[PDB]
Design a protein around this motif. Sequence first.
Motif, mmCIF file in Angstrom:
data_model
loop_
_atom_site.group_PDB
_atom_site.id
_atom_site.type_symbol
_atom_site.label_atom_id
_atom_site.label_comp_id
_atom_site.label_asym_id
_atom_site.label_seq_id
_atom_site.Cartn_x
_atom_site.Cartn_y
_atom_site.Cartn_z
ATOM 1 N N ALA A 33 73.753 78.921 36.394
ATOM 2 C CA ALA A 33 73.289 80.116 35.694
ATOM 3 C C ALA A 33 73.087 81.257 36.665
ATOM 4 C CB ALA A 33 72.019 79.828 34.928
ATOM 5 N N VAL A 34 72.490 80.947 37.808
ATOM 6 C CA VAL A 34 72.261 81.960 38.836
ATOM 7 C C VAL A 34 73.587 82.471 39.395
ATOM 8 C CG1 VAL A 34 71.253 82.449 41.114
ATOM 9 C CG2 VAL A 34 69.947 81.166 39.390
ATOM 10 N N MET A 35 74.488 81.553 39.720
ATOM 11 C CA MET A 35 75.796 81.961 40.236
ATOM 12 C C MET A 35 76.503 82.859 39.240
ATOM 13 S SD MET A 35 77.821 79.072 42.549
ATOM 14 C CE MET A 35 76.935 78.568 44.187
ATOM 15 N N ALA A 36 76.448 82.495 37.965
ATOM 16 C CA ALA A 36 77.103 83.296 36.936
ATOM 17 C C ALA A 36 76.532 84.707 36.932
ATOM 18 C CB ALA A 36 76.948 82.655 35.578
ATOM 19 N N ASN A 37 75.203 84.797 36.949
ATOM 20 C CA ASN A 37 74.526 86.087 36.956
ATOM 21 C C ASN A 37 74.911 86.928 38.153
ATOM 22 O OD1 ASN A 37 72.447 88.084 36.055
ATOM 23 N ND2 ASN A 37 71.478 87.480 37.986
ATOM 24 N N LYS A 38 74.811 86.348 39.340
ATOM 25 C CA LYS A 38 75.013 87.112 40.567
ATOM 26 C C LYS A 38 76.471 87.549 40.776
ATOM 27 C CE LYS A 38 70.759 86.882 42.317
ATOM 28 N NZ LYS A 38 69.748 87.713 41.647
ATOM 29 N N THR A 39 77.415 86.765 40.255
ATOM 30 C CA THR A 39 78.845 87.039 40.427
ATOM 31 C C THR A 39 79.479 87.844 39.292
ATOM 32 O OG1 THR A 39 79.636 84.976 39.387
ATOM 33 C CG2 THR A 39 79.153 84.926 41.787
ATOM 34 N N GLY A 40 78.736 88.053 38.209
ATOM 35 C CA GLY A 40 79.262 88.721 37.021
ATOM 36 C C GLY A 40 80.015 87.819 36.065
ATOM 37 N N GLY A 41 79.962 86.507 36.302
ATOM 38 C CA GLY A 41 80.663 85.552 35.462
ATOM 39 C C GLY A 41 79.802 84.985 34.361
ATOM 40 N N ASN A 42 80.190 83.794 33.910
ATOM 41 C CA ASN A 42 79.519 83.110 32.837
ATOM 42 C C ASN A 42 79.232 81.672 33.221
ATOM 43 O OD1 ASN A 42 79.362 84.891 30.298
ATOM 44 N ND2 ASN A 42 81.400 85.328 31.143
ATOM 45 N N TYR A 43 78.365 81.021 32.455
ATOM 46 C CA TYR A 43 78.055 79.617 32.688
ATOM 47 C C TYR A 43 77.987 78.860 31.391
ATOM 48 C CZ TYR A 43 73.100 80.175 31.292
ATOM 49 O OH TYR A 43 71.933 80.384 30.592
ATOM 50 N N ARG A 44 78.152 77.551 31.510
ATOM 51 C CA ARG A 44 77.862 76.632 30.430
ATOM 52 C C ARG A 44 77.044 75.478 30.986
ATOM 53 N NH1 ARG A 44 81.365 76.795 26.025
ATOM 54 N NH2 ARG A 44 80.155 75.030 25.211
ATOM 55 N N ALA A 45 75.814 75.350 30.507
ATOM 56 C CA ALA A 45 74.933 74.278 30.934
ATOM 57 C C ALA A 45 75.354 72.996 30.251
ATOM 58 C CB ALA A 45 73.488 74.604 30.609
ATOM 59 N N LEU A 46 75.153 71.880 30.940
ATOM 60 C CA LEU A 46 75.370 70.573 30.369
ATOM 61 C C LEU A 46 73.996 70.089 29.953
ATOM 62 C CD1 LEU A 46 77.150 68.041 29.816
ATOM 63 C CD2 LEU A 46 76.685 67.398 32.168
ATOM 64 N N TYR A 47 73.786 69.949 28.650
ATOM 65 C CA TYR A 47 72.437 69.741 28.137
ATOM 66 C C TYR A 47 72.117 68.255 28.127
ATOM 67 C CZ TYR A 47 71.396 74.665 27.448
ATOM 68 O OH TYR A 47 71.072 75.997 27.682
ATOM 69 N N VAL A 48 72.090 67.709 29.340
ATOM 70 C CA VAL A 48 71.754 66.329 29.602
ATOM 71 C C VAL A 48 70.520 66.372 30.491
ATOM 72 C CG1 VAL A 48 72.514 64.248 30.839
ATOM 73 C CG2 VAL A 48 74.123 65.496 29.394
ATOM 74 N N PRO A 49 69.421 65.712 30.091
ATOM 75 C CA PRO A 49 68.261 65.710 30.989
ATOM 76 C C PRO A 49 68.574 65.145 32.379
ATOM 77 C CG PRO A 49 67.633 64.957 28.811
ATOM 78 C CD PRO A 49 69.133 65.015 28.825
ATOM 79 N N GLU A 50 67.881 65.638 33.405
ATOM 80 C CA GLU A 50 68.118 65.177 34.774
ATOM 81 C C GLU A 50 67.701 63.730 34.979
ATOM 82 O OE1 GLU A 50 69.301 67.211 38.212
ATOM 83 O OE2 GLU A 50 70.467 66.640 36.459
#
Length: 247
Positions: free
Chosen positions: A99-116
């Motif tokens: 999410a941070v990389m997406a924000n800082k680079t101007g891109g997008n993200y998709r989280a994998l909604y699996v608990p750690e």
Amino acid sequence: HQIEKEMTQYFGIQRCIVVAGDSDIQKKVLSDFGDVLTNTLNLLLPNGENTIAVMGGTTMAMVAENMGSLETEKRHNLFVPARGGIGEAVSVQANSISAVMANKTGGNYRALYVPEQLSRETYNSLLQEPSIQEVLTLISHANCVVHSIGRALHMAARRKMSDDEMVMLKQKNAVAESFGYFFDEEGKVVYKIPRIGLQLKNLQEIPYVVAIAGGKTKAKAIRAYMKNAPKQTWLITDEAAANEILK
């Protein structure tokens, strides 16, 4: 340059970038890793739709916070975690880095909604979810992977691995971790956690593979993992790690 050459030849890899200083004792070095990764991905990533699969951890969290722009009219980057179920805290989990990389680079993200940390029940259920499958498929088609290399026992403790696993890792003399695989000094995989996402074997076919790991403290872990790393790997590291490895 000289030290970079010696490092690439030592491991038999494509490229090693050696940043000035010691990330063990100098916080700016991790920020510098962000700059270097930005420049590296700007050079490497082609136009079109790229999927960059990332691992978490302290190094990667700091790298992500210090990235610059990569998105353009013609180049669209999507960041996804390389693995789920790794056991990190939210501040350094792969979803967070994405999410941070997406924000800082101007891109997008998709989280994998699996608990750690998760149960067998949760796992089976999530695998039948079209949304979860969609992200696992995105991860499987990644054309870039970025990760650090962990010090094995430190990783096991931080990730709150089971008592049995911790004891097993000690007695198998685990030195390095990466992607949920643990490596001894011979580069042998001595253990792996249950896989949700990238297979180690499939790294070989991914064009753009970047390992980021620094500090004299990581010299042993770097050596152990890098033994069997894909030959196309770019290693971003620092003088402190390189000097120790090459002594």
